[PDB]
């Protein structure tokens, strides 16, 4: 009956493709062709954060749009005051092979993980002064590539063991598992209402999960290589991805397929990071070619370049108020652009 | 008003960061590679995510990282070890997959200038196997006498044929696992590697 099941899967995939093609009456370009372009976008460096000594791998903004956390393989998680360049906290990590870090939207915790197969929780508001390890989440058999807080008590992690997990910080147990990817789950982003999240793995696919039921709603496959970055649109009805195929693509949830592709002929390096502007009009992506490209999300035209990093742009985040964008890099420097 | 005290705290922890970096730069970091059951555990014991082993030999602190437990593709994290001093590669002579692994690591874009210390463990077991079975089974194109020394030399040549970069060297040692000289071999190779890297950093090499 294996052949019958394979044929059923093939015909289901064909039906999904036909249904998606039925809803493609017109393209996003044909709809936004008549609107005014954003023009040249010139962002200058406002701050440069010089504390790290090895390659920065992750960074995350606070909900206050002033505090940020960064991760480097020098073994330190640094909390930055962006306005004053002041370093607020320095956290030494048990394992230096960090590849992700998250900041709690309450501002009381930071997450951290990497090649040790563990997500560590750090309390920032201890009564005893210093920052202490409050929890260490250990259920993944592969490396932790991303983690994002939902609240003070639950956090979602993506892993190189091809799975995503939802945890309870108090008990330290996996409340839900998210399975269905066949490659390393390499990136993760949560929706503005935190009721669902999208992940992009190395199987050149992105899946739409919901935390409550723990099931996959939709699968989006348009890329040709491993997806490295993923981000929702501000409305939550669309998301963008970045791959090693040197392209960015925009996907609609309600249309169940790709809307636009962001690429140029002389762009060869893969995308390491991707983020949206406050209104979603600007799509900002980090590249292995040492730069960050600004895209017009509605027109798929390059609107500016964030040049000013000497090594690979590893991470990039936009503040909640939209005032600034941060880029981290393998040159061990964090830059604030505006 | 009280931002002065915050500035003072930031300067203090920047000083701590600098001291930590100076302390960390002294270590010699080595990436420890090879197939499964290739002798990696044996050499790291003679002296779940990632296993780090630290030891000191003749006033050098060595940091050894074993990545065998990462049961996923290496291309997503192999760049995390771009800055290692050298790569330790273990091969069980008494055993193709190792050749492909060495080919992939040796010609990686992140390891162009990284030297590899190649260990050929289980020398006595390899000799016993040769005395039992010919070495032509593994390599069909092996033409020559079926003695221990020439077969080992052929395998050593087969690994070093995988190198294309002139700016890197391969240090091959053969061990029988009944020895305690491996730390010394690593010391000599790493001394040579550090001399080469210092010379390159000075522009004279």
């Amino acid at each position: 009956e294996l052949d019958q099941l394979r044929q059923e899967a093939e015909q289901l995939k064909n039906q999904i493709r036909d249904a998606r093609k039925a809803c493609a009456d017109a393209t996003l370009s044909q709809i936004t062709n008549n609107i005014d372009p954003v023009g040249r976008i010139q962002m200058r460096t406002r701050r440069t954060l010089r504390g790290h000594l090895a390659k920065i791998y992750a960074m995350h903004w606070g909900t206050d749009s002033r505090l940020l956390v960064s991760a480097s393989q020098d073994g330190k998680l640094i909390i930055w005051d962006s306005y004053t360049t002041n370093k607020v906290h320095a956290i030494p990590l048990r394992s230096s092979w960090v590849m992700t870090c998250a900041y709690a939207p309450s501002g009381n915790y930071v997450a951290c993980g990497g090649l040790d197969n563990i997500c560590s929780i750090y309390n920032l508001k201890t009564r005893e002064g210093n920052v202490r390890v409050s929890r260490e989440l250990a259920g993944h058999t592969g490396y932790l590539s991303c983690c994002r807080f939902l609240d003070d008590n639950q956090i979602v992690t993506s892993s190189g063991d091809t799975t995503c997990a939802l945890w309870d910080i108090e008990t330290g147990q996996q409340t839900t598992t998210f399975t269905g990817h066949t490659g390393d789950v390499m990136s993760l982003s949560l929706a503005p209402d935190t009721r669902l999240f999208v992940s992009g793995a190395c199987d050149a696919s992105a899946k739409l999960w919901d935390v409550r039921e723990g099931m996959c709603r939709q699968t989006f496959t348009g890329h040709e290589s491993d997806i490295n970055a993923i981000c929702f649109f501000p409305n939550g009805n669309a998301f963008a991805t970045g791959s090693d195929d040197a392209t960015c693509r925009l996907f609609d949830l309600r249309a169940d397929q790709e809307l636009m592709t962001y690429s140029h002929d002389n762009i060869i390096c893969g995308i390491t990071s991707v983020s949206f502007s406050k209104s979603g009009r600007l799509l900002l992506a980090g590249y292995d070619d040492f730069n960050c490209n600004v895209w017009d999300a509605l027109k798929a035209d390059r609107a500016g370049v964030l040049a000013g990093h000497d090594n690979r742009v590893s991470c990039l985040g936009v503040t909640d108020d939209g005032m600034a964008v941060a880029t981290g890099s393998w040159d061990s420097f964090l830059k604030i652009w505006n | 008003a009280e931002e002065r005290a915050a500035l003072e705290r930031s300067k203090a922890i920047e000083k701590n960061l600098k001291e930590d970096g100076i302390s960390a730069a002294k270590d010699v970091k080595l990436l420890l590679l090879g197939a499964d059951n290739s002798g990696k555990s044996t050499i790291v014991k003679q002296m779940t995510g990632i296993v780090e082993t630290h030891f000191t030999f003749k006033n050098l602190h060595f940091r050894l990282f074993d990545v065998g437990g990462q049961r996923s593709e290496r291309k997503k994290w192999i760049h995390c070890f771009e800055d290692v001093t050298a790569i330790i590669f273990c091969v069980d002579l008494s055993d193709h997959e190792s050749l492909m692994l060495f080919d992939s690591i040796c010609n990686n874009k992140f390891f162009i200038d990284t030297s590899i210390i190649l260990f050929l463990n289980k020398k006595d077991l390899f000799g016993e196997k040769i005395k039992k079975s010919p070495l032509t089974i593994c390599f069909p194109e092996y033409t020559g006498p079926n003695t221990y020394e020439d077969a080992a030399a052929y395998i050593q040549a087969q690994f070093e044929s995988k190198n294309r970069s002139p700016n890197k060297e391969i240090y091959c040692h053969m061990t029988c696992a009944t020895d305690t000289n491996n730390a010394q071999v690593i010391f000599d190779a790493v001394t040579d590697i550090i001399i080469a890297n210092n010379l390159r950093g000075c522009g004279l090499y």
Partner: single-chain antibody, 231 residues
Framework: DVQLVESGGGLVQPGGSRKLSCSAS????????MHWVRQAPEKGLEWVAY????????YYADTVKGRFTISRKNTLFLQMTSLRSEDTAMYYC??????????????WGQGTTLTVSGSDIVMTQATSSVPVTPGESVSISCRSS???????????LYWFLQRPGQSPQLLIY???NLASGVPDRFSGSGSGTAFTLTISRLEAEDVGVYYC?????????FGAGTKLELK
């Protein structure tokens, strides 16, 4: 638990010297700045000295400079010389970590009673005593000669509550932020030079003396002290 126990006080002949100690436990002492605050038997709080985390910065009061010394085993010291009759007070040790968003002056010691045989910002509390009943709403106000609002948007007014027989406890820091553990009934508001502390649904545990303190510039100064008594 976080502890701060002080010792070394007693009957002192005038003009002598005595050393006060502040033994710390339960928290990272090295990362906190320490203050000495004294309270005369008939007066209110009075800031004395401050030593920063790492001993880089040290401050003294005007009537204290040259005669006292502050040094910091997880312990803090107050070496006092040439003691006068105006030094009779219960001395407190305070931990005051400083970073963005932090809460300085959050913990006070038990106190050590010691008896001996111009351009500063003035903190004035117009009302010294108010009659109040449980379950009602009371507002305590104080003014500052100079504006406490800074260019960075932070206004540096602090509220402290001292119950009878206990040490001062931080209630509001930077004039709007509620300290950890303080009930939500306490609220602080102000505008530049006038500040008020509003309490809703007064309880029996809120009876005491309320002090407002400025942290805009050294020397740190307290108000006269407004006392709320039952009935």
């Amino acid at each position: 638990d976080v502890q701060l126990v002080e010792s070394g006080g007693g009957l002192v002949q005038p003009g002598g010297s005595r050393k006060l100690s502040c033994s710390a436990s339960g928290f990272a002492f090295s990362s906190f700045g320490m203050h000495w605050v004294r309270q005369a038997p008939e007066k209110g709080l009075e800031w004395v000295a401050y030593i920063s985390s790492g001993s880089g910065t040290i401050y003294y009061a005007d009537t204290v400079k040259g005669r006292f010394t502050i040094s910091r085993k997880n312990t803090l010291f107050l070496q006092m010389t040439s003691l006068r009759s105006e030094d009779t007070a219960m001395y407190y040790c305070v931990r005051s970590i400083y970073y963005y968003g932090s809460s300085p002056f959050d913990f006070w010691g038990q106190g050590t009673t010691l008896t001996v045989s111009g351009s500063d910002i003035v903190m004035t509390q117009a009302t010294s005593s108010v009659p109040v009943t449980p379950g009602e709403s009371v507002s305590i106000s104080c003014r500052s000669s100079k504006s406490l609002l800074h260019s960075n948007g932070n206004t540096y007014l602090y509220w402290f509550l001292q119950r009878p027989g206990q040490s001062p406890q931080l209630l509001i820091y930077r004039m709007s932020n509620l300290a950890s553990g303080v009930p939500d009934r306490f609220s602080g508001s102000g505008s530049g030079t006038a500040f008020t502390l509003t309490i809703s649904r007064l309880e029996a545990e809120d009876v005491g003396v309320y002090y407002c303190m400025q942290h805009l510039e050294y020397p740190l100064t307290f108000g006269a002290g407004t006392k709320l008594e039952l009935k």
